[PDB]
Amino acid sequence: PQAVVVGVMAGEGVQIGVLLDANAPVSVMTDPLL
Amino acid sequence: QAVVVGVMAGEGVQIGVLLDANAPVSVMTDPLL
């Protein structure tokens, strides 16, 4: 339960699979994710 | 030479740490832990 894998959609249509931290607040991940 | 980075830990707690620029990660992940 410490992490979750999800697909992130980006510009013009690319889908990328990523393993995210399940408990950190979302605002902390958006920058490095970009 | 050195660098400072935000190290995330348990339950997502944010911590700030200073690390060497040239040493490999394997020799620093242990004392950092």
Distance from CA of A24 to the nearest CA of B (A): 4
For residue B14, the surrounding DSSP H or E stretch is strand B14-20
Least Cα separation, residue A31 to chain B (angstroms): 13
Beta carbon pairs, A and B, within 8 Å: 10
Resolution, angstroms, 1 dp: 4.5
Instruction: Please name the residues in contact with B12: beta carbons below 8 A apart, sequence gap of 6 or more.
Output: A21, A23, A24, A25, A28
Contact: A25, B12; criterion CB under 8 Å: yes
Q: How far is CA A15 from CA A7, A11, B2, B13, in A?
A: 6, 9, 36, 29
User: B1 vs A3, B19, B21, B32, CA distance in Å?
Assistant: 33, 9, 6, 18
CA distance B33 to B25: 12
Torsion angle in degrees (nearest 10) through CA of A17, B26, B10, B19? -110
Contact A34, A17 (CB under 8 A): no
Q: Where are the alpha helices (DSSP H) in B1-33?
A: 25-32
Contacts of A24 in chain B (CB under 8 A): 8, 12
